[PDB]
Structure formats: C-alpha cells, structure tokens
Amino acid sequence: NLLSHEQPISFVTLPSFNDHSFVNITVSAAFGGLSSANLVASDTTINGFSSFCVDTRQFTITLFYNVTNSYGYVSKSQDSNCPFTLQSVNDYLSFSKFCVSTSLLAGACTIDLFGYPAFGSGVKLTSLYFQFTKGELITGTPKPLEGITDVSFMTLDVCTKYTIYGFKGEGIITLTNSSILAGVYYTSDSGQLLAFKNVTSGAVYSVTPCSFSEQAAYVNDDIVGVISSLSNSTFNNTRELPGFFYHSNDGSNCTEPVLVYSNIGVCKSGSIGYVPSQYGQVKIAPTVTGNISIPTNFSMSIRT
Amino acid sequence: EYLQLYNTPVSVDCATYVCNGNSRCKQLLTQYTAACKTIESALQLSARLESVEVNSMLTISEEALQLATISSFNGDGYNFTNVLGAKRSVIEDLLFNKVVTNGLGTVDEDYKRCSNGRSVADLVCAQYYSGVMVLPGVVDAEKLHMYSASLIGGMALGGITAAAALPFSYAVQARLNYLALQTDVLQRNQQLLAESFNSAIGNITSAFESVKEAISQTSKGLNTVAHALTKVQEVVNSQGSALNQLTVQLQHNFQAISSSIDDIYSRLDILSADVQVDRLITGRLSALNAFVAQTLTKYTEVQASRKLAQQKVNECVKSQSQRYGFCGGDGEHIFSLVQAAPQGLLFLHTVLVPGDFVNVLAIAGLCVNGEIALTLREPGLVLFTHELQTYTATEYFVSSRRMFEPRKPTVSDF
Amino acid sequence: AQTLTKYTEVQASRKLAQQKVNECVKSQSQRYGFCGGDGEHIFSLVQAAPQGLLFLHTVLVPGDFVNVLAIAGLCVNGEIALTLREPGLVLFTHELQTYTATEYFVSSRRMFEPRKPTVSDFVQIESCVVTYVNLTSDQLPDVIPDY
Amino acid sequence: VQARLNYLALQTDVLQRNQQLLAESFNSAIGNITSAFESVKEAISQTSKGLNTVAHALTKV
Amino acid sequence: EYLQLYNTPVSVDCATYVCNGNSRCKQLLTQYTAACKTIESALQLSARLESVEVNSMLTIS
Amino acid sequence: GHIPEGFSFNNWFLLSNDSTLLHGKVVSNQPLLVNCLLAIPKIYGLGQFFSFNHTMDGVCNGAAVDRAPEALRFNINDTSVILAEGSIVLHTALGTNLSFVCSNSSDPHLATE
Ligand SMILES: *[C@H]1O[C@H](CO)[C@@H](O[C@@H]2O[C@H](CO)[C@@H](O[C@@H]3O[C@H](CO[C@H]4O[C@H](CO)[C@@H](O)[C@H](O)[C@@H]4O)[C@@H](O)[C@H](O[C@H]4O[C@H](CO)[C@@H](O)[C@H](O)[C@@H]4O[C@H]4O[C@H](CO)[C@@H](O)[C@H](O)[C@@H]4O)[C@@H]3O)[C@H](O)[C@H]2NC(C)=O)[C@H](O)[C@H]1NC(C)=O
C-alpha cells in the first residue's frame, strides 16, 4: 500500500464536546560563573502551582523554559521512568485520572528535565512527577479540537493512523451493518481491535490491517502470480477461485504446472489451473469364472 | 480402523506476525539474520512435502472407479448400499456429520471475505490479520471419496474389458480360496457369509448414529467403531491447538510497557521504543520457533499413520493378507473396504470368525507295508478321520487347518 | 529434548530400513507394494547415501494384458468335479465368446505364463456346481494330456 | 533373476528373447536414475516428483 | 527383544499445582479461561486411551 | 440467592472494564448472586437510600436474603429516567458525594430530545 506520507489521522473516543484545559509548565533557572557555567535559583510551576490534577476531558501539556544563561544558549533533554514523554502525552493518549507535580505523588513516574549550558555534564533543571491511570475518559491532545456532540474524527475506506478507545495502529475503518448490543469495543485473542461502536448512534465499525498477507508464486526468478484476499493488484489479469483471488499476466488455463499444491497448479507463463489426480496402473482382483485378464509383457522399472 | 493421512498445513508471514505491518519494526526485524527464512521455509517446505506424498499415494484408477461410483456394483447378495453413494456414501455422510458439525477447519475457509470489513472479523480472520494462514486441506473430500470408490470398485475389476461389474460372490469365493480351497460349495455357507455381512454393515451404520447410552466396554476396544470415532474427534479437535497458542502470544508483552508496537512507537522516545520493540520481536520469534517445533512433530506423527494406511491399502484392500492380525486383529481376513473420513481413511476390515470347531484325529502319514512312508506335501493340509477313540478308522479326509473344507486324499497330495 | 526426539524420529526409519534389507534385498516380498509401490517385486539393490541407504527397488510392470475366459473347474460325466488346487493358478481358454472351447491352459494370475493342465494340478471336490464346464471322460484328455 | 521370477509365476514360454526385454529394460532404467543424480529441476514434471522416485529421494537427502 | 507396551499415566489437579489451595489465587486463575481444562483433559483423555488400547490387546484365552 | 434457570437475561450484561466477549463460555466473578429483586412498574420512579452496609428494603420478588450488596443493578429501559439533577448520588467513604447531573448545555450551572 502506497500511503506512507499521505495517511489520515483518526481519533475515536467516548462522546465529548470541546472540554479543554492546558497543563502549562514553566521551568525557570539562572546560571553564572566565569571559569565554568553552573546553576542557581531553579523553580518549577504547573499553571502557577506546585501540583495540578486534570478534570476536563482533554488537555495539552506545554513546556515553557525561562533559562537566563549568560553564555548565550542552553540545550534541553528529558529522562522518562515513564510510559510517555511530554510531547507524546499530547499524541492522543487516554487516562482515568492524571495529576502532575514538582513534588513526589503516590504512584508516580518521573520525567526529569536537564539543561547543558556549556557542553559536557548537564544539570537537572526540574523534576515532574506524574500520577496517572490507564483508562478511557481524559485524553491528551495537541490543540483544543472543535465539536458540539462529539470530538472524534474518522476517515473511512482509507488506510489511517488511528487512536480508538486507546488502541493505536494503522488500518482501514469500514462501517458494518453487524450491530452488537453491549460494550464499546471488540478485540481478538491477539489483543488487536476488530470492531468498535459510535456509541452515540449504535453503529459498529470494523478495523482491518491495510497490508494483508499473500502467497507469491515464484518461477524462473520472477513473481509470475500472487494469491490474495484482494480484488485488485499490479498484474493485469485477476481470476476468482473458491477460497482466494489469483493475479497474473495470463488468464489462460494451465496444462503444464511447474508448481502444485493440492489441486492448484501454476504454469511457467503464470497461468493457473486445476491439476487432475494421478492415475495408477490397473491391478486385477482374484476372480473365479469371468472373463479375466492376466499381465503379459513385462517391462522393468526402478523405484528409489 | 481410522488412519489419518494428512495434517492441515499452516503458513506464516513472519513480518506480519511479529510487526503488524509497522515499518520501523520491519527495519529492526531484518537484523535477526534468517530468523524469518528458518521459520517460513520450514512451514513451506513441509507443506509442499505433504502435498506431494498424499497426492502421490491417492492414485485413482479410472477403469476401477467406473464400477463403484455408478452404484452398478453387483453385490450378488451383499448390501453395499451404505458404502458406495451415487455424492458421498451413507457411512461417509454420518461420519462427517457426527464430528465436522462440532468441528472446524476441515471445510476450507475463504479469504475473499476478509479484505472487506462489511462484516466484523471472526476467529479465522483475526488469525489472518495476525499473519497466519491455514492453507486448503492437502486433498479435498471429493478426491478422497474417488480414491475410496477406486478401491471398492478395484475388487470387482476382474479384467480391463470392463463391460459390467463382476458379481461379488465370485470375488469373495476367490478370496476364500487363499484361506482354504472351498469344496462343500452346494451348502448354505455363502448365504451365511452374505447375511452375516449384511447384518455387520447394518451395525456399523447404526453406530455412526447411536449414542453412549448404548455402549458396553467390549464395544469400546482397539478395533471397533466407537474407538474410531474417539480417534476421529481427537484429530478434529486437536488441529486448532498449536495455532491458538501461536495467536495468544501476541497479547503477551515480554516486559515491554505495552503489547502493541504502534503504541510503543507513539509514546516512548525513538531510542527507547527500539529497545522495547526488541523484546516483542525476540518474544514473538520464540513463539514462532515453538510453533514450528509443534507443527513439524505433528507432521511426523501423521507420516507413520500414512505409511501404515498405505500398507493396509496394499495388503488388506488391493490384495489379501496372510499376516495373522494386520487387517483388523484376530480372524481370517478376506477384504477391507475403505471410506473417506475427516482427515484420512476409515477401513472396514471384514474378517471371518468361526462360530464352531470340529474335533478330528489327525494322522501324520501312511506307513504302507511297513516300507513306504507317505506324508502330505503341504503344511497347510491335515489328514484326518472323524473316529477319535481309535488309532485307525472307517474313512480318511484332507482339509485345510484354517477352515474345514474336507475332500478325499489324492495321490497328488502325498 | 530436540536431540533425543531426532534420534527417535530416525530409529523409526532404521527399523524400516532393516525390514527392507531383510524382505526386499536379502529375500523377495509377496507383500504387494512394500518394496517400492505398485508392481511385482524381483530385487532391490542398495547404495550408500549421505546418512543412510538408497534402495533401488526393481519392480516389474505390465505393458500389456491378455483377456481370457476363466473356467472354475471341470464337471466330468456330471459326477466328479475337478478344481485347481492352487488359488494362484487360473484355468482358461482364449475363446471368450463361448461357454466351452477348443483347448485349455493353466497360468498364474500374476504373470501370463501358460502351460497345459496336468492331472496333478486338480483335486476332486465333494460336489459339482453350476459354474463348472459340463464335460465327459471321453474328452477329459483334450483338457488334461497324460490323464 | 530367473529364480526370482519363479516366485511370482513358474516361467514357461522361453522362446523369442523373453529375458532380453527384461534385461534391456533394466539397462535403460539404471541409465536414467544415473541421469537424475546429475541433471537439474528444469527437467522435472509433477509425476517425476512422487513418493517413490529419485527427485523425492534427493529432496529428502 | 523388549518392547514397551505402556507409559505409567500421570494426572494433575491444576488448581492445586498453580495455587496450593489459596482461595484468592483460585479466583484469579479462573480468568485464564480454559487453561486448566486444556491441561486436565489432555492428561485424562490420554490416560483413558492407554487404558483401552492396552487392555484391548492383552486379551487372555 | 440464585437467578432461576430459563430466565431471559433480557438486559443483564456480563461486566468488563475491558473488551466485550462476542460469543462463548466464560467463567467469571460477576454480580449475579441476588439478595433481592425490587421490581418497580415503569409508570413509577423511586427515591431510596441503598447502603453497602445494610440489607435492601421494600417488597421484592421470591425470597429475600439478608446480605448487604456489593453491587446494585438498575435495569431501566428508557434513559429519560436517569437524567435529572441528583438522579444518582454516590456517597464515597471519604465523605464526598458524587452526583450525576445532566443538562441541555455544555456548561452545567443551568429542548424535547
Ligand atoms: C474491573 O476492574 C476493576 C477495577 O476496579 C475491578 O474492580 C475490582 O473488583 C474487585 C471485586 O471484583 C474488588 O476486589 C475486592 O477487593 C477487596 C479488597 O481490596 C481493598 O483494599 C484496597 C487497599 O489496598 C483498596 O484499594 C480497595 O478498595 C479495597 O478496599 C476485597 O475485600 C473484596 O473481597 C470481598 O469479596 C470477595 C468475593 O468477591 C470475598 O472473597 C472476600 O472475602 C470479600 O468478601 C466480603 O464480602 C462478603 C459478602 O458476603 C463478606 O461475606 C465477606 O466477609 C467480606 O466482607 C474483593 O476482593 C477490587 O477492588 C476491584 N479492584 C479495585 C481497583 O479495587 C472490577 O471488578 C473489574 N471488573 C471486572 C469484571 O473485571
């Protein structure tokens, strides 16, 4: 599939309006010294306080650095003891609660923020402690995203990079008229999303991967045809068979298969056909009084 | 007896299984040199070997198959109606319906249904999105039926000028002659044989539709139809086992922060995301190596059944066995029919069991004039008199030891 | 576990190779297809191969068949019924279109190797049966030279 | 080979070269298995790939 | 020649192996759907098949 | 305290804080042992206090069992019944009460469907 730079984003979540608050974090530090660069008077705030906890159903984390290095610039980096990074929290993650503080919260992960004011050993500017719970209601976001009855967006029938009730992947979303009466999402034993509801309307949508697996018939150093779930492919002829499609450059039938499996035969030209059962030589039942036949001129054969 | 001929082959696209089509994960997977080659070619080169073995032992004969399939088979007293069929037989339809109704994967599923999401994907497409394909069964139930009829009709093929089917009371008389040369032929014993077989095939066809409220422990042993139905259902249920355990190992997380690769690459930094995706790659390659080891031993378990099935077709069905118990345990063998069964053949070894024994004085030989000692030439024949209470007697007979077929001695036997 | 299961996988091939040596190479097999599938066996050669044996089972296969009317036995004078002793032999005539014929032969059922019948090939069974040829002691020596 | 033919059927009609059509049919078989041990899959047909033949023996080796 | 007829069967009480009779682990173990069914029945159904296949060939006269 | 065999299960769902099972057998820890089934006609609502430390009151079908619930299941067919201010209040152990309220506005401090 040839959508690498093109592919639409999709986001589906439990029905919401535009209910947004920024968690904006200010990190401040001062530096001095003439024989080396070193740190003084660091402070951290989230929305002007030492701690914050999210209540609105969307949020954006933004970092403001307000570093006053006399040597002209500072490079900045992050360490995560955490299943996210500050810019990745914005990339449609979902939570049941989310609180951030400059001081250690009960279950918390750490993001530690570092500056390098003169290159070599860095210095810790600030530590952010995040307490969160994997869930469905509160979702991270890049910018306040508009809507009245729902905030969700989809593109159907096109390979999309999706977040759907916290599952992520690339896939095709299609509407199905296979209505289901309980829950919000349906998963395989593979842990992979198969379908989900637009719970405001009861409609159920199904998710496929956007590259399917195929068997390529390779003969004489080229792919002469391909066996597939798909109706369309690069070869200029397609044939339909009871379990699958066969794509090739030659729609004829096959009388000289160079590959067989079961009763499916693929010819050198890339034709497909059905190959008949081998016929064994006749053996004669012992019989008493009929018109019988007795084996006469015998050749010799070596079976290896 | 049920003998499995084949195992339903399975194939994997290792990049789809390990990486869910994520490009950055495929780029890491190529660093595990030949891990994919050594999984894929082990499944493909084994699925090919099954295809050439099973399609090469299922040699049909066209001039034998035309004597069974048309139901123009001259049973001449024997009721072959349950065995032949016009498409499958009565026993073949009961045997599939007793097991393939609760079964799966013995009817070939279509992948055309699963590029389009207009219906919510079921188990056999949730596997296909996980990159694992069950191939069409190595031979279809129509080729497997034609083979079975080509063996039943092969018994009526007395000669290649095949204008009508040979009356089966003649093919059974020739099969009795290899046990003992039949002599008292103007007796009811050919009808005793026929009406006994008519009752015996009536009683196998009833067991393919009866229930365990009518089973007793001797009817559950090593060569009877309830043991064959336990063995058929063990095959049909077992075929999912390795393929389910392959698929659930995709929801293990192998110490990574999540069980999905686009989740990890969309939440960690790209340096640390590669480090956690290596534990999913290593774990999922191990889950495939464990599945290839299960799958290759499940082909090897079948191949010793196939080799035995081919021996029973050549020694019990196409010819007749002098080996005492090979075709259906204790008794004198005369023929085995074959029928198609879910992933193999069902053999109906028709063995002669004696209701009665005669007791006779056996005589080693004749010491004529105290001078010339006559002995029978053949160790299969016994020289006897009916008069047990004396060393010499009214009149003498020769018969086989295997069946009581008396005749007067001839100067050519001694 | 992998190494011991591979020794067990090979032992079951070696047990077959010892059977094929003893029943195809050292002797001859009456077991129909054991030595190299459908045909009549005459000998298997053996050659050494990388980790085992390559068996060259030299079978006999018929190019042609002869079609002959088989006779169950002779019902002489309507009184004494003769049947061939051996289930591997067939008594026959080339004259398919008639219930009785010019001259009679015996052969194996497995190869067409004809000979005239001999008085030592036949046994007098207790009763005659409707499938047997109706014949007389005045012409039984047309069937059995040296009767 | 004559003694090994007798176990199948006692031989009789020895006139008109009856052994030479066996011997020359073996020469032309052993001179064909020796070609499959040095030829290549460009000269394979699906009946020449079966359960009792030299291409299956080589695949198994 | 010695030929083995039978393998001494073994059975497992899956909850007792996994949980030692701790009540609150049994509760957790039920969430691994059919994990004990697919261990218990594989051992019991195979122990039963040995019982019939051996006691059916050891026919005394 | 068991639900009778042959009951329809008309709107009783097996609970998940996760994915939903489309078909098949499962063994799970569910609020399916019943202490009482307080049936109210659809033409009445009710106001009661249900305590997770006391036995539920009001006349109820079959035999009443004296246990304090661990779950309360409300089997309301038309969701017009559940949207009003104070329609559910949940009394948390910390002495905080959490009240479900619904509005026709996206701002909660204050039309047919
Ligand atoms: C979806 O995921 C959720 C997450 O909530 C899950 O919730 C879990 O539900 C279970 C019940 O199914 C709750 O489990 C209980 O745990 C308590 C103890 O935990 C306490 O302490 C921790 C502090 O470390 C607190 O955070 C927590 O709130 C609790 O205070 C046990 O007390 C409960 O056991 C009782 O019931 C058991 C049977 O279910 C009995 O075996 C046990 O003895 C207890 O019985 C009591 O009641 C009896 C009534 O007769 C009485 O007779 C006994 O004497 C006794 O009083 C139970 O194990 C667990 O809390 C929830 N998880 C969380 C986050 O709390 C949902 O169930 C889950 N949904 C599904 C279907 O998957």
Numbering used by the authors:
A (entry chain A): 488 to 791
B (entry chain C): 792 to 877, 890 to 1217
C (entry chain A): 1096 to 1242
D (entry chain A): 975 to 1035
E (entry chain B): 792 to 852
F (entry chain C): 245 to 354, 363 to 365
Give verbatim lines from the article.
Like other coronaviruses, PEDV makes use of a large, trimeric spike (S) glycoprotein to mediate membrane fusion and gain entry into host cells. PEDV S is a homotrimeric class I fusion protein that is processed into S1 and S2 subunits by trypsin-like host cell proteases. Carbohydrate binding by the S1 N-terminal domain is thought to keep the virus in close proximity to the host cell surface, whereas engagement of specific protein receptors by the S1-CTD is thought to initiate a series of conformational changes in the spike that ultimately result in membrane fusion and delivery of the viral genome to the cytosol. One characteristic that distinguishes the majority of alphacoronavirus spikes from their homologs in other coronavirus genera is the presence of an additional domain (D∅) at the N terminus of S1 that arose from duplication of the NTD.
To learn more about the processes that mediate PEDV entry and infection, we produced the soluble ectodomain of the PEDV spike protein from the classical CV777 strain and solved the structure of this macromolecular machine to a resolution of 3.1 Å by cryo-electron microscopy (cryo-EM). Our final model contains 1,064 amino acids per monomer, spanning Thr43 to Tyr1242. Our model encompasses 21 of the 29 N-linked glycosylation sites on each protomer of the PEDV spike, with 16 of these contained within the S1 subunit and 5 contained within the S2 subunit. The PEDV S1 subunit is almost entirely composed of β-sheets, whereas the S2 subunit is made up of a series of discontinuous α-helices that are characteristic of a class I fusion protein in the prefusion conformation. The density at Asn261 was particularly prominent and allowed us to build a branched, high-mannose glycan that was packed between the NTD and the α-helices of the S2 fusion machinery. The most dramatic difference between the structure of PEDV S and that of the previously reported alphacoronavirus NL63 S is the position of their respective D∅ domains. In NL63 S, this domain was observed tucked against S2, pointing down toward the viral membrane. However, our reconstruction of PEDV S clearly shows the corresponding density for D∅ jutting out from the apex of the trimer such that it is perpendicular to the 3-fold axis of symmetry and readily accessible to interact with its host cell attachment factor, sialic acid. The S1-CTDs of PEDV S adopt the same arrangement that has been described in the alphacoronaviruses and deltacoronaviruses, wherein the putative receptor-binding loops are tucked against the NTD of the same protomer. However, after extensive 3D classification of our PEDV CV777 data set, we were unable to observe any such conformational dynamism of the PEDV S1-CTDs in the intact PEDV S trimer.
